[PDB]
Design a protein around this nucleic acid. Structure first.
Ligand SMILES: [Fe+3]
Ligand SMILES: [Zn+2]
Ligand SMILES: [Zn+2]
Ligand SMILES: [Zn+2]
Ligand SMILES: [Zn+2]
Lengths: 420, 554, 246, 111, 222, 246
DNA sequence: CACGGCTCGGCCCGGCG
DNA sequence: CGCCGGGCCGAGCCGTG
């Protein structure tokens, strides 16, 4: 009982023509942030606490004593001695907001990423500034209905960052994973788990790719992108046919050079499509398993959250995931180290609050629940790269999160690093 | 051997602001009669009380005293007064500025200029958008008119420079440089390098230290500088002409200050002829004392009386002392002692001795035999540093050979690489078919990939509100402007080298890694835009054997 | 080693311009039957087919058959220097030059170094063309210029006894209908419903150089290339082949 | 080092220390010597006129950055004409005469 | 004399070079500078300025603009983190790269000598000084402009511990650093002047440098 | 839901251009009396008053009264595509589009999405105008083009039975006198001495589009705005109102 | 440190007139 | 023959490599 709920192939986009090609693009990014502002705006306006919403351009028509709420894109974010000075911009115009140091959501406003959609409750000074008292992120429902329990326990497993072909690939540990699913386990408990795992998921970088960075060629055991995906097919082929696999690209696969990513290039990735028991999904994607909502991303933007949030350090990668879940958007940064492809309609936005969040691409294992959400980072299968050494990276290879479907929760953090 | 044109070409140092348009052409601002607001310095006629940015009075013709300004109280004080006040206001505790953002009537000024120097037929007179000097004292317009009238350009100090790749010589056959043996007898050259009396135009003379053989480019431009300096002596200063140059061969004997970049001490030199190539020759003591490396370095060459008449530190920009600088002082006598180091190793032997040639075979390091072969360190101190050098190999001409590289007559990268790599099939040595590509092919891969990575992280910018929002405004309008925002790194840039780089891969055996990288980057360029530039125009003749598709069919 | 004499050099220069605005080089298959041209754009989107029967020339002297290779740009500037009625002559002997002689009030001689042209021959005979229409020149010329306002892709719709053109952009809409009843529509041959779309740019390159006294043929089918044709002095006509879009 | 970077349009004239590149002759012509080289103008023409009088060709042995300057006495290239004949081409004017039939430049000759 | 003065200094420099050469006559002139033979400069930092400029000028033979375009300033500071003792702080600028490592390196030597003649103390950086400096090394080499010689970090701290004068100046690029707001370093950006003088100078040409130490017999450089 | 039929589309496009060169958008107050226009430049320096009595139209069908809101630029490109004698039609039904039908040799249909125009109505009736002169079109057109040489502000001087224009720059001087005796000065109505100055740019935007057979009215007083007028097919005339300078 | 693309005025038209 | 809307080019003018 699976379902590919959200998929970027599933939706269709249409370019709005206006001799110069550039004029059509610029427009295209404009439409992108447009659909952003509409989507997140709508989500904030589904909040009960948020009332008296107004256009920012009309803040002159509202009294300095009427309590109004504004929803807008955070242009900039400048902290000072008395609080924070934002420049929120909605579809009408631009306004500079202030939050005092001693408001309740002041930490929240401290950890918000620029270019997001936020909501403010407060009072617009006639001086040309909006003095806010309350901060608002699209965030998540605080009281969510439980679900009907399932007929019996069934499991799904988390993995990502296979990075096939790179000589850093801890092939042996992965091989003992494949044995592990195949019942050749060492406890009766793990045999019951394996008895009932029906689902496997893989969130990007399933081959280490080609030309991903200067000197990748030194590291490639298999310097042939075709052979990377093909050999990957030969690994995953040994999966028991009574499990279903879902696979999504990353920034290393043969997929789009920005996000979102519709799918693997069929020309290069044909070998894995041929798999009978796998289902190739997009980035991001969302899969409803027995009514369970699994948000799946490869999560380029965690590098953004840690890039802009001093006070979130590595080895604790549940925190950035909590950030991205809190802004309901998978990479609301722009122009940093995550590439956002000029489409019309932002597909990245976390539309529905899901049950569970899977990411990867930093290989630092972590799990954390926020407001009934199971954030989890399926770390890797790659030992630390020399390149990862030069950038101060420390993998946690061969760590496999085990998840029950029913409670939508991580149950058993396997570790196989002893086989690498 | 180009000229030295500022990036916006300049012809007079007079701030004009926006009032001239894009190229800050002052004469447009004049005939258009606009009025300017530019920081400038004004002087005040003590006799009459006239005020204006010029040096001499219109009323009475005496020198005008500088006017100082408080930026707070806007107080104006003649020079001696602000000398007393130590250039700080009496009722303001602030330093007195020399200049102020002011109102300039380009019309009446330029009219006074044409009235003064008697020149009217100027096509344009390109000015300076804004004085960057500390004083921001402007050049007199008359000099700008004379520059324009002769079409010579100016550089930041007020001197006219002329870059030329410099190369060394030490002996020259007067046939080569086009000079009469009697003339050379007039410059001092008595006897050729073997001491024999100079009688014929085919004896190798020894170049004396500070002579230089300019390229006929430099003749053809410095000639214009000569007509400038004459017309400036006469029409503006009211003096006798000085060069009387009519052909380039009139300049022979007139001094030119050779100046490097990066330095501030130029060397006086003398011109003794011309050649045809684009390289200004000189005795290596010259090229060294000018601090050159002569590993391809490029140098400036201004005329003497020009740099005297037209230079003043007041024009020197105040902050960015860059890669070029101005002749703060000029040397008039080489001494190869305090010149440089790299000269001190030249081989000045008439022929390398037998002991050397046999001494190479066992790969002796060079210092193991420095005592054998004469050098320049082995003549310092003695008077015979200048007297006699030598050289092993004769040339026939110093200029014989193709006088302009084929690189500059090649327009399109598409066939740029086709020439660049056209050659390498010809030679035995290069072995293109595998490495001229792959080295060069590696370069193609890096630029395209870099642009592609960057594109998704770019910035935006309007033509009129330079302010580029790190994001598109949903409206597409702009501040101040009601206009549109242009894209910084345009999609024409990403696709600029696919034609070549695809060509190389379809022709030359290149390692599969780079091939798959390139076809793969093709697919990435397409799928990066599968939702803005959809696939619309079908084509009728499909697959002319493209390496990408025919590769994938494997 | 031939010589050729054609009158009304300005006309010939016009048509050579027409061929010029799409390709940059091309070869002329001169045969004793006549002068022939055939080439395709760089984009592989349009096919120019020039056919010149020797009859059109006031004098036609070919000895054998040979292929000329010329810079269409240089020839375009040259021929463009001819005028209304001055006589055109094309001579070629042993050397690798083409001699163009413009003699009206006086004689003027030009020489053009012939250039090798790598020939990619793709002959495309009659194809399944659902509809076929003849129409005055300025009709289509006006129409294309109109579609230039609102979009970059002009859509053609051929229905029974009725020919209609259209194009739509963001907001604006452009439509041009006309039938046999209308004056400018000389003929319609409707087999059934036909519809296509074409690059308005390419069409603009096509129809420029058309007076009101210019009849044009158009064969095409549902989502397939157009073939346009028009005669030149009633003997040698030119034919373009434009691939559709989408 | 010199072959590390190859900008487009910048030719490569000989692989490092490969026999067929600029055969070496110690010496110091009238022009050269400070830091430049000399070179037979024939080899400046048979390379299709890329090199000029001053084009800084990046060297490898003596030091990076040698300017070029003509020296007619040293020995220029050895070429292979299209019809198979092998020709020693020492002087300029002969190089102009046979630049068109150069099927292969065996030896770039002196420096 | 005409680049950087002081007045009359040429007459003396010709004699002193007549007896001792270039290098030695440099230091002799330094002495007569601080001894006031050419008149009173005023404050101690003005004597520092004059002697440093004339020194480096005579050393590079006055053909470059390091004595003018490069050395931004000269200051007298205190080891306020270590013991509050005085030392000498040199403010370079980016154009010093133009005058190459050697003239850069000699700028160190004079900077060491002058403060000694002025009875000043050695410099004593804290580890935040040192590590911020090495950070400047890696970033400046990585992104701004590739140094001719890229030294290891240990070598960098070596110099940082072993140069009695401060190699500093105004920051040259908009590149923020991690060891922000170190005592006395009034900017948290990369200082390409101090960086280049550090790496391409005393490091890249330490051989020739100790050649000048030997020719001048100036202690403290073993 | 109206329809309108006007002949000589090129003329109407010309006048719409005239209105176009000063404002970018505008609304058309269509009433059963006729089509009306009234708007002001961005600079608040000129007032364009268009008056179109229904009589001028070969057919005039209005059902009620409504205001059209159109992009003067888009309409300008559209109408500009009409020619000398082809017939113009303006249709509007339920939807928010305007349908322009150019039917000469053929019919061509365009559609323009109407745009909302924030109306700032400033009606300025007769005002104290000291002098009032009629003059041929090309007279003033030549005159303005002359003052373009020497300055940017053209000065007008009206004396008893004599009309004189002038402008002065830095050294050049331009003067244009003419009286009732002269041919081009059809009428003068001198109440007393009048003098003004006006932006030569704005005048250039005004008088462009004037043949020799164009009569123009000019009312104005000492240092106060000019009002220019000229008729269109003798029924509906256009009137500009230009504020002086200084 | 150096190249190409992109857009901008200034001449240079061909067609309407 | 004039004008005027388009064409072609020289000029910034940027960017990035
Ligand atoms: Fe990863
Ligand atoms: Zn990844
Ligand atoms: Zn006076
Ligand atoms: Zn004051
Ligand atoms: Zn703007």
């Amino acid at each position: 009982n699976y379902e590919v709920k959200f998929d970027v192939r599933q939706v269709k986009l249409r370019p709005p023509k206006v001799g110069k090609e550039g004029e059509i693009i610029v427009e295209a990014y404009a439409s992108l942030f447009k659909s952003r502002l509409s989507k997140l705006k709508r989500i904030l306006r589904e909040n009960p606490e948020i009332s008296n919403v107004v256009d920012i351009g009309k803040l002159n028509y509202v009294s300095g004593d009427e309590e109004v709420t504004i929803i807008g894109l955070v242009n900039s974010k400048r902290e000072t001695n008395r609080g924070l000075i934002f420049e929120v911009e909605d579809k009408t115009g631009i306004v500079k907001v202030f939050l005092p140091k001693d408001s309740e959501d002041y930490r929240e406003a401290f950890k918000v990423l620029p270019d997001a959609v936020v909501a403010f409750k407060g009072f617009y000074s006639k001086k040309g500034i909006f003095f806010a008292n309350k901060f608002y992120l699209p965030d998540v429902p605080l009281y969510r209905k439980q679900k009907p329990p399932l007929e019996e326990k069934v499991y799904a497993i988390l993995i990502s960052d296979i990075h096939v072909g790179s000589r850093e690939f801890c092939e042996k540990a992965f091989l003992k994973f494949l044995e592990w699913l195949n019942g050749h386990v060492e406890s009766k408990e793990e045999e019951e788990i394996v008895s009932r795992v029906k689902y496997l998921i893989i969130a990007g970088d399933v081959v280490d790719g080609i030309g991903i960075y200067p000197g990748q060629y030194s590291d490639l055991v298999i310097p042939d992108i075709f052979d990377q995906y093909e050999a990957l097919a030969n690994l995953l082929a040994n999966v028991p046919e009574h499990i279903t696999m879902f696979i999504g690209p990353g920034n290393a696969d043969a997929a789009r050079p920005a996000i979102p990513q519709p799918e693997f290039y069929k020309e290069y990735a044909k070998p894995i499509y041929k798999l009978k028991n796998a289902i190739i999904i997009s980035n991001p994607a969302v899969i409803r398993l027995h009514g369970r909502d699994f948000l799946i991303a490869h999560g380029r933007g965690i590098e953004d959250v840690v890039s802009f949030v001093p006070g979130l350090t590595h080895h604790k990668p549940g925190l950035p995931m909590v950030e991205l879940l809190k802004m309901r958007h998978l990479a609301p940064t722009f122009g940093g180290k995550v590439p956002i492809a000029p489409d019309p309609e932002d597909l990245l936005v976390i539309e529905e609050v899901p049950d569970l969040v899977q990411m990867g691409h930093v290989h630092v294992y972590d799990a954390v629940v926020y407001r009934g959400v199971q954030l989890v980072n399926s770390a890797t299968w790659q030992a630390q790269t020399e390149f990862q050494k030069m950038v101060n990276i420390v993998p946690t290879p061969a760590k496999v999160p085990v998840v029950d479907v029913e409670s939508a929760r991580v149950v058993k953090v396997l570790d196989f690093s002893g086989w690498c | 051997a180009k000229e030295r044109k500022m990036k916006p070409p300049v012809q007079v140092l007079f701030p004009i602001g926006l009032a001239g348009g894009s190229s800050r052409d002052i004469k447009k601002a004049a005939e258009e009669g606009k009025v300017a607001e530019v920081e400038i310095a004004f002087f005040k006629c003590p006799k009459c009380g006239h005020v204006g940015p010029e040096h001499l009075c219109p009323n009475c013709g005496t020198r005008k005293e500088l006017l100082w300004v408080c930026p707070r109280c806007n107080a104006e004080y003649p020079e001696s007064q602000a000398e007393g006040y130590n250039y700080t206001c009496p009722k303001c505790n602030v330093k007195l500025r020399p200049y102020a953002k002011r109102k300039i009537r380009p019309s009446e000024l330029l009219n006074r200029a044409m009235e003064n120097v008697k020149v009217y037929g100027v096509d344009k007179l390109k000015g300076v958008m804004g004085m960057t000097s500390g004083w921001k004292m402007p050049e007199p317009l008359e000099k700008g008119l004379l520059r324009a009238k002769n079409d010579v350009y100016v550089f930041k100090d007020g001197t006219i420079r002329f870059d030329a790749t410099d190369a060394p010589i030490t002996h020259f056959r007067p046939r080569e440089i086009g000079v009469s043996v009697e003339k050379l007898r007039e410059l001092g050259y008595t006897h050729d390098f073997e001491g024999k009396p100079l009688v014929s135009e085919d004896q190798i003379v020894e170049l004396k230290p500070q002579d230089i053989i300019l390229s006929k480019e430099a003749g053809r431009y410095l000639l214009k500088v000569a007509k400038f300096v004459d017309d400036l002596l006469e029409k503006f200063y009211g003096l006798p002409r000085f060069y009387n140059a009519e052909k380039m061969e009139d300049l022979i004997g007139h001094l030119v200050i050779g100046l490097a970049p990066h330095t501030s001490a130029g060397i006086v030199g003398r011109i003794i002829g011309f050649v045809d190539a684009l390289v200004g020759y000189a005795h290596p003591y010259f090229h060294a004392a000018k601090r050159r490396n002569c590993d391809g370095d490029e140098d400036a060459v201004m005329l003497l009386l020009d740099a005297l008449l037209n230079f003043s530190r007041y024009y020197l920009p105040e902050k960015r002392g860059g890669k070029m600088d101005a002749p703060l002082v000029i040397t008039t006598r080489l001494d190869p002692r305090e010149v440089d180091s790299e000269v001190h190793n030249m081989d000045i032997v008439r022929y390398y001795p037998l002991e050397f040639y046999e001494a190479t075979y066992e790969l002796k390091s060079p210092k193991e035999l420095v005592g054998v072969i004469e050098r320049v360190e082995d003549r310092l101190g003695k008077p015979e540093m200048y007297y006699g050098l030598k050289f092993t190999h004769d040339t026939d001409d110093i200029a014989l050979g193709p006088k302009m590289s084929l690189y500059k007559q090649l327009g399109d990268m598409e066939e740029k690489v086709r020439r660049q790599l056209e050659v390498a099939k010809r030679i035995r040595a290069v072995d293109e078919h595998g490495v001229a590509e792959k080295i060069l092919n590696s370069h193609l891969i890096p630029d395209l990939r870099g642009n592609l990575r960057s594109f998704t992280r770019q910035e935006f910018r309007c033509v009129k509100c330079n302010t580029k929002f790190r994001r598109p405004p949903l409206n597409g309008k702009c501040p101040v402007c009601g206009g549109k925002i242009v894209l910084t790194v345009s999609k024409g840039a990403i696709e600029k080298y696919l034609g070549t780089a695809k060509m190389l891969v379809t022709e030359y055996n290149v390692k599969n890694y780079t091939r798959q990288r390139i076809c793969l980057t093709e697919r990435d360029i397409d799928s990066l835009f599968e939702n803005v530039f959809p696939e619309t125009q079908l084509t009728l003749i499909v697959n002319p054997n493209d390496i990408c598709q025919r590769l994938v069919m494997a | 080693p031939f010589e050729i004499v054609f009158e009304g050099a300005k006309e010939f220069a016009q048509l050579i311009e027409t061929a010029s605005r799409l390709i940059d080089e091309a070869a002329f298959k001169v045969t004793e039957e006549g002068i022939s041209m055939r080439a395709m754009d760089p984009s592989r989107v349009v096919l120019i087919d020039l056919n010149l029967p020797a009859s059109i020339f006031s004098k036609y002297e070919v000895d054998g058959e040979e292929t000329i290779g010329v810079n269409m740009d240089h020839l375009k500037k040259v021929l463009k220097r001819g005028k209304a009625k001055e006589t055109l002559i094309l001579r070629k002997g042993e050397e690798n030059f083409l001699e163009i002689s413009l003699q009206g009030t006086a004689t003027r001689t030009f020489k053009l170094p012939l250039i090798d042209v790598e020939e990619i021959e793709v002959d495309l005979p009659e194809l399944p063309f659902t509809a076929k229409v003849v129409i005055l020149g300025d009709v289509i010329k006006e129409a294309v210029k109109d579609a230039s306002l609102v979009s970059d892709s002009m859509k053609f719709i051929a229905k029974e006894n009725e020919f209609t053109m259209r194009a739509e952009g963001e907001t604006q809409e452009v439509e041009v209908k006309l039938t046999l009843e209308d004056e400018g529509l000389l003929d319609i041959e409707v087999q059934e419903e036909t519809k296509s779309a074409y690059g308005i740019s390419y069409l603009s390159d096509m129809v420029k150089g058309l007076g009101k006294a210019d009849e044009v043929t158009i064969k095409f089918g549902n989502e397939m290339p157009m073939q346009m044709e028009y005669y030149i002095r009633d003997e040698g006509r030119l034919i373009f082949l434009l691939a559709p879009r989408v | 080092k010199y072959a590390k970077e190859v900008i487009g349009g910048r030719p490569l004239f000989s692989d490092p220390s490969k026999p067929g590149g600029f055969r070496l002759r110690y010496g110091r012509s009238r022009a050269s010597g400070f830091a430049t080289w000399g070179i037979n103008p024939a080899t400046m023409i048979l390379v299709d006129e890329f090199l000029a009088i001053g084009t800084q060709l990046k060297t490898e042995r003596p030091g990076k950055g040698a300017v070029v300057t003509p020296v007619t006495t040293i020995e220029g290239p050895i070429v292979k004409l299209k019809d198979g004949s092998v020709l020693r081409v020492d002087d300029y004017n002969l190089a102009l005469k046979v630049r068109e039939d150069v099927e292969e430049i065996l030896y770039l000759g002196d420096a | 004399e005409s680049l950087v003065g002081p007045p009359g200094v040429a007459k003396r420099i010709r004699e002193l070079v007549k007896e001792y050469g270039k290098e030695i006559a440099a230091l002799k002139i330094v002495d007569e500078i601080i001894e006031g033979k050419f008149g009173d400069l005023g404050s101690r930092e003005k004597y520092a300025e004059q002697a440093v400029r004339t020194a480096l000028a005579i050393l590079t033979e006055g053909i470059v603009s390091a004595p003018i375009e490069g050395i931004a300033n000269v200051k007298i500071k205190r080891n306020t983190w270590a013991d509050n003792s005085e030392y000498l702080a040199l403010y370079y600028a980016g154009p010093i790269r133009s005058s190459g490592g050697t003239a850069q390196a000699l700028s160190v030597l004079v900077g060491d000598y002058v403060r000694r003649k002025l009875g000043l103390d050695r410099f004593k950086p804290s580890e935040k000084h040192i590590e911020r400096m090495v950070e400047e090394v890696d970033l400046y080499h990585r992104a701004v402009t590739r140094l001719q010689y890229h030294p290891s970090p240990e070598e960098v701290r070596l110099a940082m511990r072993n140069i009695p004068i401060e190699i500093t100046g105004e920051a040259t690029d908009d590149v923020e650093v991690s060891h922000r707001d170190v005592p006395g370093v009034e900017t948290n950006q990369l200082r390409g002047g101090a960086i280049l003088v550090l790496a391409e100078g005393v490091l890249q040409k330490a051989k020739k440098l100790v050649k000048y130490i030997d020719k001048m017999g100036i202690e403290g450089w073993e």
